Paper text:
The first strategy was based on mutagenesis of selected surface-exposed hydrophobic residues of the 3A proteins to improve the solubility of the respective GOLD: 3A complexes and their capability to be crystallized at higher protein concentrations. This approach led to a successful crystallization of the GOLD: 3A/PV1 complex with an L24A point mutation within the PV1 3A protein. The overall structures of all solved GOLD: 3A complexes are highly similar to each other. This suggests that neither the L24A mutation in the GOLD: 3A/PV1 complex nor the fusion-protein strategy used for the GOLD: 3A/EVA71 complex affected the overall fold of the complexes. Analysis of the crystal structures of the GOLD: 3A complexes revealed that the 3A proteins formed either one of the crystal-packing contacts (as in the case of EVD68 and PV1) or contacts with the second 3A molecule when two GOLD: 3A complexes per asymmetric unit were present (as in the case of EVA71 and RVB14). For instance, the poliovirus 3A strand β23A/PV1 binds in the antiparallel orientation to the strand V402ACBD3-P408ACBD3 of ACBD3, while the aichivirus 3A strand β13A/AiV1 binds at the same position to the same strand of ACBD3, but in the parallel orientation. Superposition of the crystal structures of the enterovirus and kobuvirus 3A: GOLD complexes reveals that the enterovirus and kobuvirus 3A proteins bind to the same regions of the ACBD3 GOLD domain, nevertheless, the polypeptide chains of the enterovirus and kobuvirus 3A proteins have opposite polarities.
ACBD3 is a Golgi resident protein involved in the maintenance of the Golgi structure and regulation of intracellular trafficking between the endoplasmic reticulum and the Golgi. However, in enterovirus-infected cells, the ACBD3 GOLD domain interacts preferentially with viral non-structural 3A proteins, which causes re-localization of ACBD3 to the sites of virus replication. In this study, we present a structural, biochemical, and biological characterization of the complexes composed of human ACBD3 and the 3A proteins of four representative enteroviruses. The crystal structures revealed the details of the ACBD3-3A interaction, the 3A-3A interaction causing the assembly of the ACBD3-3A heterotetramers, the interaction between the ACBD3-3A complex and the lipid bilayer, and the roles of these interactions in facilitation of enterovirus replication.
Residue numbers in the entry:
A (entry chain A): 365 to 436, 474 to 528
B (entry chain B): 16 to 56
Amino acid sequence: SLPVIAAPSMWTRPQIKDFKEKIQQDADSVITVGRGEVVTVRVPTHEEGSYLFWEFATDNYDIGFGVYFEWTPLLDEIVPVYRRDCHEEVYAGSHQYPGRGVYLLKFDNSYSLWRSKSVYYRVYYTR
Amino acid sequence: PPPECINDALQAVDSQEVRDYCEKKGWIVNITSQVQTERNI
C-alpha cells in the first residue's frame, strides 16, 4: 500500500510580541511577502519518523499558510493553505516525517492586492 | 527521548523556555537559517 501520512498538529500561544522581538534578532527569519506574492520556505531533507516544528507570526494582518511535503516531483498536502490570524497570536504546529524529503511552508499573500505582509518564522526538527 | 513525546509536550506547555530546554539537551535543532526561499507571483 501507499504510505499512510500522519495528521498534522496545530496550536497557538498568546505571546506574539515576545516571539517577534526574539525572532527579530536573526534578520533572515523575517521576510516581507509582497502584494499577490507566494513565498515558499523549503526545509532541508531529514530522516523518516522525525518531526518538523514550525512557528510563525505577522505584524498587522493575516496571511495564507499551508504545508506540503516533497518526496526525494511528488507533493503531498499536509496542511491545506488557508488564512490565519497570526497577527493576533503566534501560530505553531508539527508533522511527523513520512519519509525522506523537503517540507514546503507556504506563506500565501496572493489574495492581497494592496497589502504586503511581514512574516516572522522559525523551524526545528527532532534528531 | 521519543519524538512523539517531544511533540505531545510542545502542544500543552509551549514556551521559549521549553524549546530552549529541548535544544540544549540536543533533542531539537534550529534549522531556520538553512532553508531555501522561492518567491512566485
